[PDB]
Amino acid sequence: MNIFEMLRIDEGLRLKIYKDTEGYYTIGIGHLLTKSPSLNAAKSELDKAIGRNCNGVITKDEAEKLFNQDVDAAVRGILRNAKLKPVYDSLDAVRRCALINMVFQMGETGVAGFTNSLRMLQQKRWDAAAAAAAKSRWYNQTPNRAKRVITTFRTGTWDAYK
Ligand SMILES: [Cl-]
Ligand SMILES: [Cl-]
Ligand SMILES: [Cl-]
């Protein structure tokens, strides 16, 4: 299992504009288009992001190209962030993927908000980190996804995804 396979499971793949869990216009593999209530705003974002007039529909290749960009951006973002980098550097491979997953879903700022969880991860206190992360809006809004990511942090294995 790898980061792409993991996120493909968590996010799914849709080739037409759709609304995410929070009601936002998205496409492909979890690619947020706009927070705006406007479908026209969504279509405009999409055309800009793809480089062609898509009329709210993309190909599989196009979805995978956005996904590659998004994963790359998440990893580089982690590496540039003063609060996230040291945690990433301290973790083993599997757990690194768990962090990239979180950043992909909530952004760098959001993840950096989990102060205590990050501290616990850095100290290798797996159960404590898991318990802290569960006390969040994130966990209450998307529990199944959260539990899979938390388990990954907890065990350092891909069990939750197999
Ligand atoms: Cl926390
Ligand atoms: Cl809570
Ligand atoms: Cl969920």
Whichever domain contains 116, its CATH number is 1.10.530.40
For residue 148, give Cα distances in angstroms to 24, 114, 145. 23, 17, 5
**Which residue range forms the structural domain that includes residue 150?**
1-162
Q: How many domains does the chain have?
A: 1
Cα of 129 vs centre of ligand 3, distance in Å, is 19
d(CA 29, CA 65): 10
Q: Are strands 14-19 and 25-28 parallel, antiparallel or unpaired?
A: antiparallel
Any catalytic annotation for residue 47? no
Which residue in 5, 10, 20, 108 is the catalytic one? Answer: 20
For this entry, resolution in Å reads: 1.7
Residue 34's DSSP bridge partners are 25
First and final CA of the chain: distance in angstroms? 9
In this structure, what token pair is assigned to residue 140? 């209450």
Ligand 3 (ion): residues with CB under 5 Å are: 142, 144-145
